[PDB]
Amino acid sequence: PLVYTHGGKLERKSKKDKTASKVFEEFGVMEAYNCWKEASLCIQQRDKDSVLKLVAALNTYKDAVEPIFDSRLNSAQEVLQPSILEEFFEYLFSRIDSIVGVNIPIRHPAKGYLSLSFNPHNIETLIQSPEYTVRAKDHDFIIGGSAKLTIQGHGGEGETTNIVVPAVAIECKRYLERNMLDECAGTAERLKRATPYCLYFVVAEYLKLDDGAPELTEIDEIYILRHQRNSERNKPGFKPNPIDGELIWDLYQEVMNHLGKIWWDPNSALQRGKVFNRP
Amino acid sequence: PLVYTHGGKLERKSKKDKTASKVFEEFGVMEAYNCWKEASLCIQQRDKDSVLKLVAALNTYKDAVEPIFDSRLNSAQEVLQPSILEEFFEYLFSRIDSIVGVNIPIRHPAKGYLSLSFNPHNIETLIQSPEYTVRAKDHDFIIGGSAKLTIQGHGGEGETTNIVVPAVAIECKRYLERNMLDECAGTAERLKRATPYCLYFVVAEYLKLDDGAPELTEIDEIYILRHQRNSERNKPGFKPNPIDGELIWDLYQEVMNHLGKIWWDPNSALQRGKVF
């Protein structure tokens, strides 16, 4: 198995909560899930209809399962539903190796690198082997690479830390309220300092944002997948929109573009006379 | 109305340095300059060919005087040479009032607002009349507005400061090296915090190649006008490329769009959503 973020939380949640285990048994969550997974992995191409099909299965599984997580559970809006989308992105980008050339080690939730700072214990350790911190940051989904960072002082053979250098990072939220969109603006800033070529998206199903006023962030795209407000979800009669396959198709197109580009290329700068060729 | 930055630095430099004054007359800098100016003001339209024409005059004037500035002048890349493009932008945007609807006060070099912090002398002045500082930053060229900022205490008239709130800010550099592109990243960050809707450009003639991946954190566009490297200028065979009128045409098009757009809209920014 590649990653399967959702599937694993299913098995972990049922391995720690026996209540939940029976709920998953009784309402056939596990069959629903396996079905979703099977449906998704067999989609081999990535033309628009291919992608639309994945979204189709996504909608189905969410329709089949989310109501159980809402009414039959207790704590399922923390790391049980936010993972359906995480795993979805795993499927969406399962077949990119063959298409972008190389074998990308990271296409799951991951801590994306931000900073390296030095916190030596004392003058001796400073000289001999300075203690350091790498600050990273949880993202719901990262396409990127794994690196080893080592610091050696006079003595040691160096403390090593494993780090993740992201090329795309995606936040995945059921609904996007202002509190969260501030976090995301905030880490976009940091993220762009650390990894200037990391594309950064926030993706939500609903937008729970009070009309307020517009925000210049360093986020490359926000996506509200169901085109709806959150005011609508807990009122008279249900009726949620499907997750819009169009948006996912777009998001896919932009990421693949990104992984296609040489990101510095001064030669093409000089050639054109612009560093930021936006057509 | 119409500011003339280069002309004035010519005028300043010569009242100051009398050696340079003689150099200016001997090599006919003054005639060259006003010719450049004359040529430029009489182009009134702003279609693509119009703009190309201005660039033509630009290239000529640069060709006519830059050599003098290099050879015959002590120190000239400080402001003398950079001011040419500054003034050029003055000509390029001289007819925007009639095109954008409003009478824009500022289209010259200017200090663009950045921050307000409070540094009161003591507890009394804190209450009574707090002392403050406005931090602004020199830009090569700004389209924007003037504003007056007043702070009033408990009892008093309030200290006023004049400030400039830019809509477009353009840096103008002959050549762009890593060291400078960091400065520009650095002030872009500040600038975007202070004035989120201010477009921010760097415009250069030559750009250094091998130097290292730079920080272009929040610069809206860089322009290398001559498409060349900055290491070909002091080699056996000169051969500098003309400033590319295509690029200037672009830059013009981007700025005019910017000034045409509604920027901030407090209560009609829901549809925006997830397009663009």
Residue numbers in the entry:
A (entry chain A): 7 to 285
B (entry chain B): 7 to 282
Provide excerpts from the study.
Earlier mutagenesis of these residues confirmed their catalytic nature and demonstrated that the site in the R1 subunit cleaves the bottom strand of the target site, while the site in the R2 subunit cleaves the top strand.
Purified samples of wild-type BbvCI, containing a 1:1 ratio of R1 and R2 subunits yielded crystals under acidic conditions (pH 4.5) in the presence of an excess of duplex DNA oligo containing the target site, and 2 mM calcium chloride. We initially calculated MIR phases, built an initial structure, and conducted refinements using datasets corresponding to the latter (heavy-atom) space group, and then subsequently determined the final, higher resolution structure of the native (non-derivatized) protein in the original C222 space group via molecular replacement and phase extension. The resulting electron density maps clearly corresponded to two full-length protein chains, but no density corresponding to DNA was present. An intervening four-stranded, anti-parallel beta-sheet (residues 116–175) protrudes from this core.
